[PDB]
Structure 1
Amino acid sequence: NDNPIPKSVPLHPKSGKYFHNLHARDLSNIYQQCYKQIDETINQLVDSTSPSTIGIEEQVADITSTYKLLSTYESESNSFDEHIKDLKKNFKQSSDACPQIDLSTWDKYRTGELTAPKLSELYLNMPTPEPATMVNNTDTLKILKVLPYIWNDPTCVIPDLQNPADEDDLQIEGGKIELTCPITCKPYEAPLISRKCNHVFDRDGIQNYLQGYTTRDCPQAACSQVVSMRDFVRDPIMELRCKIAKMKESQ
């Protein structure tokens, strides 16, 4: 109509080159660098504060808020990239479905009787990203949340998975966690915990116990399961507790 500018045209191979070239800017490296920086900053903060100095709760809360915001931003970026991929796939499929203008089809598109997919309209109509199926729970978040209690005292029972109020009703009855193992009278140089056992072991005598047996029962009580050497993973909580205990005794 009037000025011959059609709203949209079918995709061309030359246009297809630019469509293939177009991509969302990738921030995965930037997000990984930001996560590494914040994690190392939390690790530095753990021993940065003077042991005599108390009142780190506000700093921990601020860093927790920053980490939650970063996690929300990462989830939104994942939603953005997946939405971009889906929009590109839908646009290419719609362009392939639509016929090609040769002699008069372009005139029909210009008159507006014929419509073709447009990326701008599809992007505007694209649903807003939703932070759904994303859990903001990481080992770094857990250690950041539990470090104030560890700073107050080496032994604490923060997890409330069994009961929201406490480990059992109002009374924890959890005793104390000792840095020095009864089996090996030394600090845990290699604190390793199993995903099933959920118990931290030095692994100096655990390797010897596991030697010659494919699976061995967990020495600690309150659990009945057999785990291999590969099941154990590094536990930062135990090393942080040992470091804070050493700093407090020295000061």
Structure 2
Amino acid sequence: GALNDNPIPKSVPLHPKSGKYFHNLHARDLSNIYQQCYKQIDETINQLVDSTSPSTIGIEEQVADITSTYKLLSTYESESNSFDEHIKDLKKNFKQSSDACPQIDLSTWDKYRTGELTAPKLSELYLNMPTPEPATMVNNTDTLKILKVLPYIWNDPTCVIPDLQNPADEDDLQIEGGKIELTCPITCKPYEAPLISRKCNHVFDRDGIQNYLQGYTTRDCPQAACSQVVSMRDFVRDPIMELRCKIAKMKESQEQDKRSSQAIDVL
């Protein structure tokens, strides 16, 4: 073996001065950037519902592309998360192994440079550090729920998708065939700020669900044939119902504007 006449050792244990430097070694927290992205995508969803003409089809490709984009972005966030986790574990292991390795003096300088003493090398260990993998892909936002279901919702807005409440399971959500009512079962009114129940997936207008539960702490689900005892906290904003009602109302508004104009042309 060609010993190091270059007294720089191949590997050295953690020197305390750089132990401090090593403390500063970390992957940057990009989760703020990802939250900004997720907020932008949610606003994109809302404005996509707001603008898209319900009489015009062809948003399925838009939603699918943004679906793939957001899955890719969540994958990147997860890669960074697993990268940070691997950095933490790698730092812990490197510190333990280096501290298990003799500290550096002239004698250990010669031993480490000649290979007599070997210590973990953060460059080498970082190469040996597990590659950033998707760790907890951020799919649990309402973003991927809409980006997944919105082609089909565009094909038919009133369709019931019963597995929109669990974005935590990253398996593809199997949409069951159904139609969610466009009228509040309580007030018999179209949804304005609809609240969905996490227990039975029945969605009611916020005013309607508040009125049904008014005067009592918890009451049964207002939808017919449902006995789920629910309260205001049990109901959370339903982006899906807002999307459905919004699309339906916009289609009706286009129809009504054309009908009202001809309705005046009659007089």
- TM-score tier, shorter chain, comes to 0.7 to 0.9
Give how far 1:62 is off. 1.0
Higher mean alpha-carbon deviation, 168-177 vs 57-66, is at 168-177
CA distance in 1, matches of 2:176, 2:27: 53
Higher mean alpha-carbon deviation, 154-163 vs 92-101, is at 154-163
Give how far 1:115 is off. 0.7
Change (3 A) 1:41 1:162: closer
What's the CA shift string for 1:115-164, capped at 9, x where partnerless? 11110111111222333664745422222333333333332134479999
Assess if the C-alpha contact under 8 Å between 1:159 and 1:167 holds in 2: no
Change (3 A) 1:113 1:82: same
CA distance in 1, matches of 2:151, 2:233: 31
Assess if the C-alpha contact under 8 Å between 2:186 and 2:222 holds in 1: no
CA distance in 2, matches of 1:171, 1:17: 50
Q: Which runs of 4+ in 1 moved over 4 A?
A: 132-135, 159-176
Provide the aligned C-alpha RMSD in A.
4.4
CA distance in 2, matches of 1:172, 1:119: 48
Structure 2: state its 5+ residue gaps. 254-267
Match of 1:125 in 2: 128
Higher mean alpha-carbon deviation, 141-150 vs 105-114, is at 141-150
Assess if the C-alpha contact under 8 Å between 2:9 and 2:114 holds in 1: yes
Change (3 A) 1:135 1:222: farther
Give how far 1:7 is off. 1.2
Structure 1: state its 5+ residue gaps. none
CA distance in 2, matches of 1:207, 1:164: 26
CA distance in 2, matches of 1:95, 1:168: 41
Higher mean alpha-carbon deviation, 15-24 vs 131-140, is at 131-140
Equivalent residue pairs, number: 250
Higher mean alpha-carbon deviation, 121-130 vs 146-155, is at 146-155
Assess if the C-alpha contact under 8 Å between 1:192 and 1:233 holds in 2: yes
Change (3 A) 1:168 1:78: closer
Higher mean alpha-carbon deviation, 163-172 vs 47-56, is at 163-172
CA distance in 2, matches of 1:170, 1:124: 37
CA distance in 1, matches of 2:220, 2:94: 57
Assess if the C-alpha contact under 8 Å between 2:196 and 2:238 holds in 1: yes
Match of 1:171 in 2: 174
Give how far 1:188 is off. 2.1
Give how far 1:67 is off. 1.2
Give how far 1:175 is off. 7.1
Assess if the C-alpha contact under 8 Å between 1:166 and 1:172 holds in 2: no
Change (3 A) 1:79 1:198: same
Give how far 1:234 is off. 0.4
1:160 has 2:163 as partner: yes
3-state SS of 1:213 partner: coil
Higher mean alpha-carbon deviation, 156-165 vs 129-138, is at 156-165
Change (3 A) 1:87 1:56: same
3-state SS of 2:196 partner: strand
3-state SS of 1:104 partner: helix
CA distance in 2, matches of 1:228, 1:184: 17
Assess if the C-alpha contact under 8 Å between 1:160 and 1:167 holds in 2: no
Give how far 1:170 is off. 18
Give how far 1:182 is off. 4.5
Identity %: 100
Higher mean alpha-carbon deviation, 128-137 vs 21-30, is at 128-137
3-state SS of 1:205 partner: helix
TM-score after normalising by structure 1: 0.84
Change (3 A) 1:227 1:171: closer
